[PDB]
Homo-oligomer: 233 residues x 4
């Protein structure tokens, strides 16, 4: 179809579980060669097995997005063995230090992969926001504000080169980190969601898949909220 | 049955489908497998829609619909229900000296009343099926000055607010409500100046709007509601 | 039978609004009343409106009791006839209002009709008073949000979105004429409805507000007073949120 | 009714980057409202100029050297103020710092945080406070809109963290202001720029200062986390 990513190398950070894993499989399903990262070797191996078990070509790697050395080395590894990643999905992650640290990691990784996208005159950077999950509202709303601003600016800097930069802002998603919130807090959160249910990780992955397609080529600087109608600021 | 982005077995209603973006949306939804009903305000335009659909192998019809009239809306909807079935995908693209910065209010207010009128009518069928997609298309940037920016930004502001609220009203029923906000989509040779406000350096294509709409209509966009997806190549006027 | 028009050497340093005539709609209670007194305190001649003659009289008494020159009038902002007549009345007897504060709203398909009705009333009233502001080449229109917090969460974000868009657009249409158009978006304000909540729910509500307290009506009035001053002359199209740090989207 | 405290008599205000333009205008406005004002610059010449301006306008205070990018500069300066003048309860951040898009915004917000944190002990102590952050005055749209986005988000979050203590945290987002940068634009570009501003004119530095003066008063006590745009109707996002 025209949703196809055949011939594209996608890099998905933090792909051993939940939303990251779901994004890796979705992009794989659309035909991309997928490289998923975790911070440990056990997690890199688990990614590799998941990809095999779902008929997706690619690899798992160890990547620490807080380290320039990790980013440089990893990127070079990918370039030699697989090719240049033109689809990059940032999902890997003191109110201030959290947001500030994250956005610096977004920038670090974003900058590094841009040489390859520039060279090809085509690209997709997609940034995944933090999931709503029980200091909590303050940090969430801030991390979302910083992401929206960041994404918009970067999109402006790189647009001339045919590179889109977008974000996806999850609401309350069904994941391992959310499955075991207390009932009281879960129920409260359901009560603020017009659809009356948690989102699925796959439902985030679908949005990401579309932003990566050629059909989303005029969409850039956007933050698509995926939250069942619940908007927390 | 069950596939990523198939609309097989869905009836989609696309208003203002005789040209440009509306036409592109009708063909995109048809391509994805929906049975498409496209409307225009004139009979000539209804006929042209029918031909386009036939010429592209899309099952459906062209109809005359005036979204400003409760009678037109009722009658048309009843016609569709008897002959084709219940539309569960509805796409609102019908919207009404040089332009000035005092035309903003009547235009926006009239459009949102029409959005509501139509939205309300099709909701009984979506409620009854416990599934639905309403997608509202914004106006493309209409003119080159402040007066052009005033009307655009306002029509967008009202659409964002409207869409969000309606989504909240109908969410419990598994009905998503979203918008698409086009930027500059495909005369006077301040062309270059205009392209210089757009990071991608080009006008958008009507097909590029249609793709976004097609996704919002799919099962994969089921958790997306109340959103206004901007499709403007990186150029943001508020 | 109902009289619908009711009137009434110490120089306070607060008196910045120099005889100017301010019109404050819905001024019989709460935030509207607080705005009328604040503008009066700053030296304006204040005309406050209600929809009934009893309310027009109560406004007049409040203004008298606080040493504020002006009047209470009957005004129905949903009616072109009421708006025209009232505004002509004001012109003949008191002068041309150059400060106008829209606080007369409407409350409880309900979601759309409320917002849509209010914005039409805003436009109706705003259009009418503009001839006088145009003629003077100076003006202040201020719209009070219903984008009230007690009005609650379900329709709040929408009423705010419509107000913010509206305010911004009108500001653009009238700016060349030295007329500012701005809004004030209250959060949770202390009024008689909000006082009589159970402790259990009161505490929950206060726990969503960083300042840990309800706002006072006077605190909204102060913001309005500033937007009306010459110092806020470069502020236009703005919606100032006044909610103690609680932001609902 | 007629008698209340929109006065700042008895308050110590700290205004960073106060040697010219908007900073200077803010320092004189707060002084005019009765505050004891401490204005900072990065050079000693600028600290002197601030002191003269304050003297010349009958405003009690001082000019100091402050580098908001340095923890040592911030600590020392604050301690100096505490010993000699008292505890600043009004703080106005107008001092900024110099593919440059991210580092600028990121550096500024780190400075905002550094300074904000330091002055909070004193505000906490008194259970009252005003922090006000001034945005940058107008590739050009990218940097402006970003710096505004990061400020709006920052301001809002900090306001949440400190609200229980009766401390408001707000921002002012200037549009096109009449200052040294704008005095040297070509007529062609000037006219184009005015044409995008509904009021049809540049803002004055004093017009920013008035907004700041209000946010510092007791009447703005329920306003927190807000970014007040002061741009004559011209909104770039
Ligand atoms: O009815 C309006 C409306 C009428 S005019 C208008 C507008 C907005 C910006 S300029 C004019 N908005 N709105 C705007 C937002 C909204 C939400 C829910 C129901 C109604 C509405
Ligand atoms: O630290 C940043 C930050 C660093 S760069 C940046 C940014 C935002 C828009 S473009 C760059 N934002 N932010 C942005 C918003 C925010 C809120 C609370 C704590 C931190 C932050």
């Amino acid at each position: 179809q025209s949703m196809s990513l055949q011939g594209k190398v996608a890099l998905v950070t933090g792909a051993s579980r939940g939303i990251g894993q779901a994004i890796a499989l979705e992009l794989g399903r659309l035909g991309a060669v997928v490289i998923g990262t975790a911070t440990s070797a056990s997690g890199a191996e688990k990614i590799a097995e998941t990809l095999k078990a779902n008929g997706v070509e690619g690899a798992g790697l160890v990547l620490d997005v807080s380290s320039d050395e990790s980013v440089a080395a990893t990127l070079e590894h990918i370039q030699q063995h697989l090719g240049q990643p033109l689809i990059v999905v940032n999902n890997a992650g003191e109110w201030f230090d959290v947001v500030n640290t994250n956005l610096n990691s977004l920038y670090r990784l974003s900058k590094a992969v841009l040489r390859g996208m520039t060279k090809a005159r085509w690209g997709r950077i997609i940034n995944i926001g933090s999931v709503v999950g029980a200091a909590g509202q303050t940090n969430y709303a801030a991390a979302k504000a910083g992401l929206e601003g960041f994404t918009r600016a970067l999109a402006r800097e790189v647009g001339s080169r045919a590179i889109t930069v977008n974000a996806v802002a999850p609401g309350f998603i069904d994941t391992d980190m959310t499955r075991e919130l207390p009932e009281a807090q879960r129920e409260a959160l359901l009560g603020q969601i017009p659809l009356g249910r948690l989102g699925q990780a796959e439902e985030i992955a679908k949005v990401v898949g579309f932003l990566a397609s050629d059909g989303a080529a005029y969409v850039t600087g956007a933050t698509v909220p995926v939250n069942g109608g619940m908007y927390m600021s």
